[model samples]
Target: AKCVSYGVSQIKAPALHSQGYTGSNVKVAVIDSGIDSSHPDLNVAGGASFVPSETNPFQDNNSHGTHVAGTVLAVAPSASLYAVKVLGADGSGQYSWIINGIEWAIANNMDVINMSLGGPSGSAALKAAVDKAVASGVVVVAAAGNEGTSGSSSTVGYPGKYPSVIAVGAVDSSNQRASFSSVGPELDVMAPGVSICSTLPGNKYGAKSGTSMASPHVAGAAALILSKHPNWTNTQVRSSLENTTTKLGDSFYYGKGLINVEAAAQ
Candidate 1:
């Protein structure tokens, strides 16, 4: 129950509270399986459904999106959480689905877009959408991948590898590179990923692992920063985070280093 007991809130929530900046109307678009919009912590304002013929995108068939959503809310409880379902129950999805979600998020003028999923493949459609998001001035954050240790090269995962996106890697509470974390030159930042606990549907909580978990902590921290300086551009926000990061490695394991939520908000 590490996920149920500890999460980004341990760092982000306290940091936001200390800074006195609540994410009142900031919007975060979560592109993943889906989220239970009714979940108390998820302040769903509006969203689009990328799932095939689905009645609602608010239905979370897998717990990945739910956990990601929880981290976003825990850090910026007042931000609007928009559920953009792109993956299915089996945790498999097409690249086009993710592209469509990005398009929808852009059209809606979202402040931040959080993608907790990635694939080994890439599509022009998906890349173009990411480019469009960058043009539209939306901050994009993605999971680097979970395949770093499986005979894989140091290449980052699809969307995370995309230049316009901020690729997030994982680290533990001790600030060490997580054994399973994807490490490469593409990594832009790192966040606590081990034993993370967060809210779930039905008013419950649980723990899970992956860069999927690490990505949202940075997303939530971004929300906290956006709340304070609503005029800062995506690049500005990204720079602030990098400049404020607490370095933690001798092997480039932690990119810009572990996230410092307090520094980010200030």
Candidate 2:
């Protein structure tokens, strides 16, 4: 059933940094948990927390944000990182907090906004916030909530479902759609999101999976695109990323397809 069984004499991955496309000078804001600034691998430019209880963006009581941050760093090592802590240590937060986080990113002139969090429900108030970010030329990428299967109904959540935002779904290493990855017409792309290892708080590393994890790939890819095309509009950057993907399957499940960083860079 497969072409030549897809055998390869040798296998290797693309050299993102050696190729001189390390997302230099681009600014990316992780609007999730705060990053562990002390982590040896993560270089946080700076950030602010919207969580009332935890006023500092440097302190990540929950490692969710830290892990998310590490992935972006892995893809775009040279891209400036900002930790916009919206979720608390318990790994839950209100939409208002995320709204505040997006506003902060806008005020600070961030180039890309990566949102790895979302609820199954949509909100007009949340829609306005991302719309504003898109208008300001920030490429907003979000996860297509992790509650889905083959249902005809749409599972993509707020912000991700918004027309102006780029909704991202998840696929595993095999380039197959994850059963948990939500699918919807609004979805725009896919990224690796299964059993992926990344940084954690307290200078640690661990593996996690979800549409949430898939989003940072697109976010980092956006930064990489911007690094090479600093003068390109947000629309141009998004189109380039989408145009240069390795197609997987249905549009609802895979969106444009799995991200191909090397192909996108070229």
Candidate 3:
């Protein structure tokens, strides 16, 4: 599938791309496991590792970061992509590492921070970091978690649950919420996540599903909006994304709704 997927069209990202708003001059940080800088499709400008013992933060031992990077770049190809390695090869990391990554993003003047990884517990440090990023005019976005299988309303994870960050949930190609997507008041939007195709490690392409895949869509959309309206505040950018969404349901499941990059860019 060399062409853009239905998910991309569903959100109308290509429309913004056509208008020359390919996130140019935007700096987006992907705080996940890591990124395979060697991947042919990813244009990783730079990155660092908060995970201890990691010698090379640009080398992605786990493919999760690369996948998320692919989705982000898919929508904002010209954006400067930064890979902040917070998680290790195990797909899990301490909240301290996440906080460190957030701090790094803030110090580096990242326009948007995409966190496709989350845990059940909330950390004061992480919340503070997210709040600080928002205060610094950086748009923070995170996955709402994949605990929807438990049928619990408290499935939303932090820093996603924080009021400062945009929490994202997963929806399939049919425009329905995924069975495994966490839902709660924190969920701010939905995007195509199921069977979502993106770049993988080893210069490959494959499909995966999770709120992890949903966040980058909004993050990329934010980048696109910033590329066009360089003077827009973080609040204005966030409002454009939420207000322009294709409303689906209540705030718990869909929040503002599915993101429409074209509408947001306008």
Candidate 4:
């Protein structure tokens, strides 16, 4: 699932950096399985364990969180990383756990929150938590799910599909829509979700695929923009990103289009 060479660099990354954006003081909260804070590429600020009290949320039991965290850092090495574990190593989790993570992120006043995970069910508790984050002016990005393909019908996945959260879809290195990418009108933007390279545990780097990989590119780019203009609100940042994106695919598939950090930063 790792596809590092086909990631966001060709567009989103270079676009933001060229505008003098390095995401210096921006803080990003990653609510997922967990992250390897010890990884050299990570500049973790702090985090919490929403799982059982006996488990250490600091250690990544799976690759998902580590990959997402790396995407944020790859483009914003100077930004602070916060780990909030809601899912266990097996990629299994309950709604209560995820909601707790969202509430925690909000209470912490995270400037940007990235959720690379999703579920098939929707919870009122979950929606409220997400709305709270939006009201507080925190930007939220979530995977639009990789559920659909040529023959089946797929709707937007929960949380990511929710109205307040920015739903992300995936594209390949050529900027063509991934065959497996789920599509719908709910999709807010598209990013590099196939063959993305980033940090993993044990002082290593690897690649993975999914809208999960694409999400943090948006988060990282937001951090870069926030670093330059700390006064900007979440709505303002999102609008700028959408307006600056180089529209891709058909409107039904790409939404606002592939994220372009160059135009976003300006």
Which candidate gets the maximum lDDT versus the true structure?
3
Task: State the lDDT of candidate 4 residue by residue for 151-264, as single tens digits.
Answer: 434456878878899888888888888766777777888888888898887778888888888888888878888988899999988898888888886756887888887778
| Per-residue accuracy of model 3 over 148-175 as CA lDDT, tens digit each | 8445456888889998999999899878
- Candidate 1 per-residue lDDT over residues 1-266, each given as its tens digit: 22432555545557675667766678899898888777765667877777795547787777678788888877777788898888887776778888999999999999999998888777788888998998898989998777665443565788998888888888877777778787777788888787778767666688777888889888877888898899999888888887888887743456888778777766
Q: For residues 34-103, could you state the per-residue lDDT of candidate 2 as single tens digits?
A: 8889988889999999999998898888899988888787778788999999999998888999999999
Itemize residue pairs with steric clashes in candidate 1. Answer: 3-196, 3-197, 3-198, 3-207, 4-197
Better of 1 and 3 by lDDT: 3
Q: lDDT of model 3 at residue 244?
A: 90
Scanning candidate 3 in windows of ten residues, the lowest lDDT window is 1-10
TM-score of 4: 0.94
Question: Which runs in model 2 stand beyond 4 Å of their true positions?
Answer: 1-15
lDDT of each: 0.79, 0.82, 0.89, 0.82
In model 3, the Cα lDDT at residue 101 comes to 93
- Name the top TM-score candidate: 3
* Model 4 C-alpha lDDT versus the unseen true structure: 0.82
Task: Give TM-scores for every candidate, taking all chains together and pairing residue i with residue i.
Answer: 0.93, 0.93, 0.97, 0.94
